[PDB]
Amino acid sequence: PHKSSLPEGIRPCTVLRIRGLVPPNASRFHVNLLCGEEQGSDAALHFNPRLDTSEVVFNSKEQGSWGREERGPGVPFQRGQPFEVLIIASDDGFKAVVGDAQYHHFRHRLPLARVRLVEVGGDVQLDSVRIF
Template sequence: MAARDPESKCVIKFPDGVYCGSKVRLQGNIPPNAQRFSINLQCGPRTDFQEQVALHVNPRFNDMNVVRNHYAGGEWGREENSGGMPLSKDADFKTVIECNEQAFTVSFNGKHFCEFAHRMPYHRVTHVMVDGDVSLRLVSFPSTE
């Protein structure tokens, strides 16, 4: 599913909801002219920020960091942006986000990047949305077995 155009968005439902141990894996390519893209674990399928977002992962190449946040009640929470930029433009990437009891863990290209403590009940998450400067090849939900 291509999502290079900022207006182009990919929304996929978690097949079994989100629970401790659930994962989403994304693989794709970041174009050479990328500015930013986002991965949102959200509480519904809408693409216009009318849904609550339990985790917003937003690589920003112009700032060379990855912003993490949540969105609830029509407002963004406190941004987290430590860790630098683990991704490169004009390159393939793999991202895995896993849910545990305390936080979502995010890895890029097989390396742990961060944890984002739950700010809302994770079991309310129903969909993953990806948009911005990225081309996706795969979105999957590996089992924990």
């Protein structure tokens, strides 16, 4: 997995670019924007493509409780295939771009100032993760 500290927090217009491959036997993988590395802590964004159940779930987490889930339209990910995700942190929320198209806009639940850590893991084979 990728696990990167953002010590200075993220400021409006941070762009996370994730390039990788979905393994042919993949279940699920995630991109998390978190407050910190203590296990089970706050998540401003939990982005969770699920190949096993044909859905992409967005959510937040506070004080140990998942929020209200959102689902993206369809599944722009395929077993055995590469992908490129952009996550664009503006003042409105997180715009997820997959492939050549905007995929979903997840409006902020937590303050952006609370993100200190990016985590990419699960069933995914990474080419690169960049924070611009």
